[PDB]
Amino acid sequence: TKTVLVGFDFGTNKSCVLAGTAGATDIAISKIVPTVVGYVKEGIVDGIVAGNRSVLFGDDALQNRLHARLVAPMEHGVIAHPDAARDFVQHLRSLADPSGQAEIRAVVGVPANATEQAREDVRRCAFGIFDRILLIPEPFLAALGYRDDARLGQSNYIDPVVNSLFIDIGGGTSDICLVQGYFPGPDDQISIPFAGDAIDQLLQEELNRTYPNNGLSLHKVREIKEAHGYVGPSRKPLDVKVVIGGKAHTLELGDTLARACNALIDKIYPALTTLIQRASSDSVVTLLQNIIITGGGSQIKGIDTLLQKKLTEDGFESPKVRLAGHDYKRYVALGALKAARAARENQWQVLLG
Amino acid sequence: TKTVLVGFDFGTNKSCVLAGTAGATDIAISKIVPTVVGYVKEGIVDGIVAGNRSVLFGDDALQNRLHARLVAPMEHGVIAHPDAARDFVQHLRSLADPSGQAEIRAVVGVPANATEQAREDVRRCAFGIFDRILLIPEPFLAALGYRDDARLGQSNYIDPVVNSLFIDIGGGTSDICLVQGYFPGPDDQISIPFAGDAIDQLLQEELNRTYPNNGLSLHKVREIKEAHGYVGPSRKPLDVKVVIGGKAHTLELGDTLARACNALIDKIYPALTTLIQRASSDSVVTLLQNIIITGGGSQIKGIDTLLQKKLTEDGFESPKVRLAGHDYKRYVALGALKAARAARENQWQVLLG
Amino acid sequence: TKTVLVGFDFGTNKSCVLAGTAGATDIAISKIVPTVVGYVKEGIVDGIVAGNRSVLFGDDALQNRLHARLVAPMEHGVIAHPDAARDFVQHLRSLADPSGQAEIRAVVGVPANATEQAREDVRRCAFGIFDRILLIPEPFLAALGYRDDARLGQSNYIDPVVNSLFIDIGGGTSDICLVQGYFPGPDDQISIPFAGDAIDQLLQEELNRTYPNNGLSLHKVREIKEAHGYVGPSRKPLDVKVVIGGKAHTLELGDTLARACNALIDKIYPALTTLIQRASSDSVVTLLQNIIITGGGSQIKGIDTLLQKKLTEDGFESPKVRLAGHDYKRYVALGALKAARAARENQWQVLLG
Amino acid sequence: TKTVLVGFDFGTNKSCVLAGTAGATDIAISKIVPTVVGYVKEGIVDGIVAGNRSVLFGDDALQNRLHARLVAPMEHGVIAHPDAARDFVQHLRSLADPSGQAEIRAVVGVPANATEQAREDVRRCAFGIFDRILLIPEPFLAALGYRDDARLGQSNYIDPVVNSLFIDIGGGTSDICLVQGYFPGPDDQISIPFAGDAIDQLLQEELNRTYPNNGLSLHKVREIKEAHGYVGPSRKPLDVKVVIGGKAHTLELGDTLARACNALIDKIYPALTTLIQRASSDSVVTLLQNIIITGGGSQIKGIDTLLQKKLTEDGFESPKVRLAGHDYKRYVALGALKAARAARENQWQVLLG
Numbered sequence A, B, C, D: 001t002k003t004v005l006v007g008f009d010f011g012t013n014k015s016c017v018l019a020g021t022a023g024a025t026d027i028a029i030s031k032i033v034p035t036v037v038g039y040v041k042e043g044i045v046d047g048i049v050a051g052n053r054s055v056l057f058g059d060d061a062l063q064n065r066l067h068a069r070l071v072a073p074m075e076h077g078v079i080a081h082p083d084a085a086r087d088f089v090q091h092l093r094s095l096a097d098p099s100g101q102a103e104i105r106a107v108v109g110v111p112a113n114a115t116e117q118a119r120e121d122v123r124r125c126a127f128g129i130f131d132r133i134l135l136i137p138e139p140f141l142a143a144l145g146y147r148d149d150a151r152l153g154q155s156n157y158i159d160p161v162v163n164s165l166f167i168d169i170g171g172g173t174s175d176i177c178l179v180q181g182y183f184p185g186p187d188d189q190i191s192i193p194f195a196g197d198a199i200d201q202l203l204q205e206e207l208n209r210t211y212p213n214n215g216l217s218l219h220k221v222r223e224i225k226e227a228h229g230y231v232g233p234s235r236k237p238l239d240v241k242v243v244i245g246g247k248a249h250t251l252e253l254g255d256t257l258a259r260a261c262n263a264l265i266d267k268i269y270p271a272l273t274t275l276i277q278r279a280s281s282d283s284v285v286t287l288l289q290n291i292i293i294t295g296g297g298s299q300i301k302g303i304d305t306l307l308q309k310k311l312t313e314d315g316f317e318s319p320k321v322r323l324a325g326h327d328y329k330r331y332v333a334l335g336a337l338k339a340a341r342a343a344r345e346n347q348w349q350v351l352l353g
């Protein structure tokens, strides 16, 4: 049979699976599936769900979220629902391996400091799916996939892995990591369970507190944040057109979005400065010049400017906070695929049980 | 009152206690008790442990390791847990003295270059237990106990004490010693804290790295090494039948045991050659012909052949590495008993305070 | 006053009270009273209930269930109706102490992982009834009462407490517990609120869904399950003679009972294997040989064979699932009485308030 | 500007701040604030807390512990909550400096062998508060503050610093120190994280084990120990009047307080005798005559007599265990102020960040 190395980014909001053979460098499969499993509701009529499938994954479960009970397999970057997570990894295996006969060797991205229970949860929802697994911190894989191997060696290209600080603000955890060329130790990374889902929850609370029984689902309170959420000083007026009870209302969520998204900064800044002061004095001056924000939370309006302003005001020697880029979804999966093709035979973990 | 001279081999894995009267040469008591103390767990049901004992020693603590919290009194050939060590020495005193009224004079075996703190640790967990103590290095006691006094003087018997090199590869330390007829000086012996427990730890790491959350206890990772561990070139395939999570699996640990046990050789060979080149040039040609491996580590499959091969390949004049024999457990205790019966009245150390 | 140690198995379906003096080993009082309180209905004619009692307990409330409103004090192994539970414990106190003057010291059996609120519920409906209380998990007490103290020490008697796995499938909870010689920790036991009452509810739903308005009470849907309920493959045809609307009908409930009782296996097997894989690898090979099912749910037709089959096909090393025996009702009460006579003076909890 | 030298005793139960100018010997500010920070709860009605303060410190937080969430900044003599500790040191700075404009130079008392992390926790919660810091072990500062400089030189006054052994039994740690005239080395002191809060925890466990759901807060289980706690043989009957569930009960806590308080002796005695045997033989005969107990734990009923009895029974040459005195709270702050006024310009540590 053939072996398929799979860079797997098991996220709280969206997972991304990449599949390629050994020796080569191209990417056979590259899918970005929202981490959600929809169990088609009991009593569903035939023809409502295309193919009468009883379990939907990703967008197929988000479009049919009216007919399906949605369950997010992952919460705070760790597996919260083992059965849904197993179903979802089983779906993504068929995605990364359409034939279903190849031996999958997956490097799955775990949070920065994932507890051994949170790692056995991933090694248990991957048994019988992935033949060999390898659990690497998510921000290190983000640094490894953001790195342009085609542009290495050049002088006009600064390596994001040689000396940088990666602030992978996902949708479950916000992992900061001191990526200093090698596999980061337990002290080179800090994971805060406050990210996109926490800002969604804060907006849900500040909406059910001022506009009670609004009925706005978390999937819409998330779109409000993705479209209008911002960090920094309040922006008023900021009219958000919502649908509350069938009727179209226009809420004023300037202060609401400001307080919801600035809590993320207030959470990740004490851990940003902690790792900045944990770095070696010889290398921190360039570490400040190479601070990179990845993950979905990098798309928050004005987060790099606010973080660089807060690091400059605190006296850090000329920080330069940078955004990862447009491909913030595949960075952890690209890094996990690069770490799969570079993993030694003795590095892969055997999944028995 | 009567005096009982006790040859005590306080080991990291097994301690062997011998007891005999003065003047005679027979051996009254001879016990080999695994150095372990199991404190019966809180809430134990009556009748689970025979006699409702709350502290179990040796095999009684290994058979009842499910109901008892086991603590190893000794780590790296030095007392690591003083309370468990004192409990264990108190048990072995009752073993060497069932009446409990005789004055015990014990020669305890310490590592090759045991620090004065590591020796006061043994003289402190023996106060009130042994009336007089005498601390002699463990490999010299192994040389003394391996020596056959019934076969001395004969021409067809080579004395292991007259001029030999003893590599007592224990379970905590691997002490190499130039046994040249007399009490070895501090430069005639080298102690490396790498032995059976270090190979057990290396196997535990190599198993939790490839077969994560295997749950194999150290007492089973140790039996794997005793049954299949080997030094030399890798032997594949070498199937080890284990029980991981209730289910019976068959792991492939050829390279694993190879890398685990060859680290012991890589550790003890720089100290083997150091003392071979420290010996007098007049006597080193005979030293190489009398290289003897004792301790549990002598039972590793193919360790004398590997060490003789490494010593011949390095150009040493015809080395002949030999195993101690089947009685590798009592050799330090036999030597300590022979050193107790030959100790002058001024050699015994008084334990006060 | 005299002290009476009372082993109390407060069950969801039946509670077993045992009473004995201190120091002795005989059992003075031993009653099995169905956990139910029948409050005699308003307007009851004199002479309908023997003695004109207004509150009936156990069988006296089951025979007079036409004249009394029955309330089950316990649901899911925890006290659900505090007033009925206090009345019922007050009745069982008079059962264990007919004189009503002795100081009762009761060891009540709680579920495996009973929350502190579920324990204060039992310590609150026992205040003024039991002078000292002691709450121990129900499966551990089943292990302690199944143990035959007359045959301890013998070689031909395997101890159910030294190392075993007890599946106390009651009528409210199904508690699995790693009984390994000592008081089980919070991780050695899992309690699932799915047992006899859950299968009763599943049968009630599957009967009100196919045979609507059948009028079969839960007390008859329960007898259907006790008489014909089975786990494993469906058995058709399986005719159950019932009385629906006064008329005698003969339903076909092969698939119905199959699906109702196999849900219990589907619920308790993920928690069975969880503790099988939680046990130490040194003792799991014996744990699988000593898997014991107690409680009412042990009487389900073919549950030990089915669970042994499911554990064998999953690769567990030669499991051997055994049934507790005929005396499955007194095992928790016998164990609580053995734990009362062996409880230290500082183990008894004082009930004030 | 003016400089204010501040002897700061940052305790687990009570922190004492002393402030004085340079050159003089009088004490400008002397406050004893219980180390607690009460964050006023959300939704507090105006007028409940005097001044509508949102953060209360010391007694102001203990009197309003019903309206405020109390957090102890310090646990085991080290800073456990950095934010509450920073607020608390900020309050104590305003206490030692009402004007808030003077340059504060604080000598803060750390435990005996405070780890460098536990010292950077104090230098980090003091940055921007104290301009210069100096961390000295707490028992040495207690020895320095117990010293009567007004009585030095006299013949009828034995100096507590020239040669003594201080058992500062605080509320977080119980530090024993060989105070032999100079700054004690790392081997002249032992810190045990078992003191007042550990006895409070032991009493809480022994009360929730015998009188379950008693609801007695730690602040009341602490007053029980302060009013009735004793070391030595059990004192029965010892009736303690408590309030359990609104109702006034009278518990018997003779054995309870005995076992709770004698654990402190059993913990601090192996470290007491360790330093007694670490002292020079020339000075140990005087050291035993000058054994002094300070800190809150010195107020335990019969602790000096019990420790002197235990030291005499062990054969130590005529020990004389003495209590510090009534002013056991300001001794560490008095010594820290005496060491601030005697600290050289190069001894002060600059706090930058």
Ligand SMILES: Nc1ncnc2c1ncn2[C@@H]1O[C@H](COP(=O)(O)OP(=O)(O)OP(=O)(O)O)[C@@H](O)[C@H]1O
Pocket (backbone or CB within 6 Å): A009, A010, A011, A012, A013, A014, A015, A076, A077, A138, A169, A170, A171, A172, A173, A174, A196, A197, A222, A225, A226, A227, A229, A294, A295, A296, A297, A298, A299, A300, A301, A328, A329
């Ligand atoms: N433009 C935006 N503004 C604000 N938030 C956004 C934006 N785009 C995405 N997000 C948030 O980012 C989250 C997704 O994060 P991302 O996809 O970067 O990493 P992730 O895979 O979710 O991280 P993890 O692996 O920790 O789950 C979503 O929950 C979403 O709420």
Ligand SMILES: Nc1ncnc2c1ncn2[C@@H]1O[C@H](COP(=O)(O)OP(=O)(O)OP(=O)(O)O)[C@@H](O)[C@H]1O
Pocket (backbone or CB within 6 Å): B010, B011, B012, B013, B014, B015, B076, B077, B138, B169, B170, B171, B172, B173, B174, B195, B196, B197, B222, B225, B226, B227, B229, B294, B295, B296, B297, B298, B299, B300, B301, B328, B329
């Ligand atoms: N056949 C074998 N193969 C490999 N290792 C073995 C074998 N037999 C014993 N050992 C190892 O030897 C170790 C101890 O045996 P031995 O009695 O020779 O040393 P020891 O006296 O316990 O050690 P020390 O003197 O350092 O305390 C054990 O930990 C065990 O792992």
Ligand SMILES: Nc1ncnc2c1ncn2[C@@H]1O[C@H](COP(=O)(O)OP(=O)(O)OP(=O)(O)O)[C@@H](O)[C@H]1O
Pocket (backbone or CB within 6 Å): C010, C011, C012, C013, C014, C015, C074, C077, C138, C169, C170, C171, C172, C173, C174, C195, C196, C197, C222, C225, C226, C227, C229, C294, C295, C296, C297, C298, C299, C300, C301, C328, C329
């Ligand atoms: N032969 C049988 N077949 C199927 N179910 C049975 C049988 N006998 C009893 N049961 C069920 O077992 C339940 C009683 O369980 P048991 O008496 O073993 O413990 P319990 O007191 O219910 O414990 P708990 O209160 O923790 O549930 C009853 O509800 C009944 O439905």
Ligand SMILES: Nc1ncnc2c1ncn2[C@@H]1O[C@H](COP(=O)(O)OP(=O)(O)OP(=O)(O)O)[C@@H](O)[C@H]1O
Pocket (backbone or CB within 6 Å): D010, D011, D012, D013, D014, D015, D076, D077, D138, D169, D170, D171, D172, D173, D174, D195, D196, D197, D200, D222, D225, D226, D227, D229, D294, D295, D296, D297, D298, D299, D300, D301, D328, D329
């Ligand atoms: N009379 C008493 N009996 C018993 N314990 C007491 C008594 N008085 C005070 N305590 C205990 O002493 C503790 C306070 O110790 P003290 O004030 O002597 O030093 P501390 O500053 O708290 O110690 P640290 O500096 O280690 O925090 C309190 O927790 C209290 O429980």
Ligand SMILES: [Ca+2]
Pocket (backbone or CB within 6 Å): A009, A011, A138, A168, A170, A171, A295, A332
């Ligand atoms: Ca991510």
Ligand SMILES: [Ca+2]
Pocket (backbone or CB within 6 Å): B009, B011, B138, B168, B170, B295, B332
């Ligand atoms: Ca040895």
Ligand SMILES: [Ca+2]
Pocket (backbone or CB within 6 Å): C009, C011, C012, C138, C168, C170, C171, C295, C332
């Ligand atoms: Ca039961």
Ligand SMILES: [Ca+2]
Pocket (backbone or CB within 6 Å): D009, D011, D138, D168, D170, D171, D295, D332
């Ligand atoms: Ca103090």
